[PDB]
């Protein structure tokens, strides 16, 4: 049937400058040695992106897929959402958003410039006026770092990103933003992935695992999801979006973004020229996470139907996805995945890794993460999220004129806290860096689901606290998958082992501790692991003050 893509040989172009690593990277020297390893991914790499995501899809639709998006369109018709007001949109623009071809930007948008508010009228009329001429988009080369993988190829070619002009993002926001809010969890319930913090992931896995008689889980790894859903995937999103009670004129205008946007369009590199031609999801609009999550909810509750899968319990994030089911013995569990990947198949969702049915939740990798577990001092068992610490340490040793990898090494910490490699190794070096820059009092930019948050590094133990729980201050005894891994990464990467990380976080503690105050409970509360003579820890008040609620919900 249709290709996700079509071609016209011009380049994908870069915006400008793609940034050279220096000789000397003076804030990540001390934490890795191994910098020839770290690397960004540029447009450079860009047309084998390209090959890789274009393909040809067929699909073929069922019984079960029918019956369950029936139960999912009952389920959205109990949702009302409004449009929002063209200025509510504008104020919902990141403070860094991509500038308008028009002459504007964020900045513009989020100050109700009179000019914006007069592009996005206008472009807004010709959505209610004409529902049918594509919107043109810019397609660009995604710049992530990550460490050379020799097993895998080496180096990742970049993701690609596609996205329309500002002015028409803005509108997506009024269209379609309050459904972005509702439709999820009003569809999927506590399936919806996006609504919770490690903490609550985990405590929910458990909660799913303990109710089966028998639990067997696994993990469904869809190969390029985006280029893998179809006009008619999306058609069917917009029939679900219309399911609610909306405004006639948010119904004209979904069908309008539908038809003119999310199906398909024609894209343009940086320099002007046509660049190809989209029939999948595009990466840059607003409804691609909600779209992903729901698509592949319907999809995979399908596929489980149809491979008979007893009593699912799901957790879907994009193209993430969880199982967790009543096992049917060991070889009906293996048959009954072949079949879900077969229907899932059919569904136009095929998998990179073949899934593979398991019966200890540690060995459940999705997201990129798994539970694991630690012991108290006592012997209790405390589980925890926890992930491979390769690519969180290749981020952190990100530096160049541009970019500075502290932001980076927050934001793992906030997610991870309670991970043997977050506590030995990174907060360790970044407690180092800010007490000898002498900037442990200035606040930071904690990055999550494109929102940011000031964070003040000397509040880490409240906060972490308030994530995580007390226990997150004292996992004493770690797993052998968990410690096999992090001391392998930390070779792979040329940083010290664990046991000198334990020196310097003594060293660390001591200057902390010394420096009294906010300072001196970092030191008490984050390190006391590092030390052979317990400190008793104990709930922290300014912790109760904390509301944290709106970081892991999107
Ligand atoms: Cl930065």
């Known amino acids: 049937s249709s290709m996700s893509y079509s071609w016209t040989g011009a380049l994908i172009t870069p915006c400008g400058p793609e940034e050279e690593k220096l000789p000397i990277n003076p804030l990540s020297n001390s934490l890795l040695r191994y910098h020839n390893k770290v690397y960004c991914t540029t447009s450079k790499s860009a047309s084998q992106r390209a090959k890789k995501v274009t393909f040809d899809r067929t699909q073929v639709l069922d019984a079960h897929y029918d019956s369950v998006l029936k139960d999912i369109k009952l389920a959205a018709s109990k949702v009302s959402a409004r449009l929002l007001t063209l200025q509510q949109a504008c104020q919902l623009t990141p403070p860094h958003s991509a500038r308008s071809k028009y002459g504007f930007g964020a900045k513009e948008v989020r100050s109700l410039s009179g000019r914006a508010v007069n592009h996005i009228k206008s472009v807004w009329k010709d959505l209610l006026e ?47 933003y309050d459904i972005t809010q509702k439709l999820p969890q009003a569809v999927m319930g506590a399936s919806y992935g996006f609504q919770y913090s490690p903490a609550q ?49 948010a119904r004209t205008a979904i069908h309008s973004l539908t038809e003119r946007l999310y199906v398909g369009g024609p894209m343009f590199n940086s320099k002007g020229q046509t660049c190809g031609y989209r029939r999948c999801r595009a990466s840059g609009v607003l409804t691609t996470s909600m779209g992903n999550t729901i698509t592949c909810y319907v999809k995979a509750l399908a596929a489980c139907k149809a491979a008979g899968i007893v009593a699912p319990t799901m957790l879907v994030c994009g193209d993430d996805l969880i199982v967790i089911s009543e096992s049917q013995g060991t070889e009906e569990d293996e048959r009954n995945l072949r079949a879900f990947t077969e229907a899932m198949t059919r569904y136009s969702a095929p998998p990179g890794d073949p899934p593979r049915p398991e019966y200890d939740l540690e060995l459940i990798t999705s997201c990129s993460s798994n539970v694991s577990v630690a012991l108290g001092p006592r012997g209790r068992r405390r589980y925890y999220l926890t992930r491979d610490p390769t690519t969180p340490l290749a981020r952190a040793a990100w530096e160049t004129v541009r970019h500075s990898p502290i932001n980076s090494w927050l934001g793992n910490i906030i997610q991870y806290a309670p991970t043997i490699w977050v506590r030995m190794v990174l907060m360790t070096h970044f407690f180092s860096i800010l007490m000898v820059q002498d900037t442990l009092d200035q606040n930071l930019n904690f990055e999550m689901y494109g929102s940011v948050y000031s964070v003040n590094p000397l509040d880490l133990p409240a906060i972490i606290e308030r994530l995580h729980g007390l226990d997150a201050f004292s996992m004493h005894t770690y797993s052998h998958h968990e410690l096999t891994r992090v001391a392998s990464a930390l070779r792979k990467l040329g940083a010290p082992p664990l046991r000198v990380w334990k020196s310097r976080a003594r060293a660390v ?45 999107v």
């Not at 050379?148 to 269209?175: Q, S």
């Not at 695992?209 to 995937?233: I, N």
């Open 509 to 553: 503690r001591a200057s902390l501790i010394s420096r009294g105050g906010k300072a001196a409970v970092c030191g008490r509360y984050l390190f006391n692991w590092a030390v052979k003579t317990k400190l008793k820890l104990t709930p922290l008040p300014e912790a109760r003050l904390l509301d944290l609620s709106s970081w892991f919900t």
């Open 130 to 176: 004409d529902p049918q001429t594509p919107i043109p988009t810019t397609i660009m080369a995604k710049n992530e770092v990550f460490c050379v993988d020799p097993a895998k190829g080496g180096k990742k070619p970049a993701r690609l990103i596609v996205y329309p002009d500002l002015g028409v993002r803005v509108c997506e926001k009024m269209a379609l």
């Open 201 to 249: 992931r985990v405590e929910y896995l458990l909660k799913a695992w303990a109710e089966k008689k028998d639990p067997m889980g696994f993990s469904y790894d869809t190969r390029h999801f985006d280029s893998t859903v179809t006009e008619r995937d999306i058609r069917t999103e917009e029939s679900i979006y219309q399911a609610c009670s909306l405004p006639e004129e």
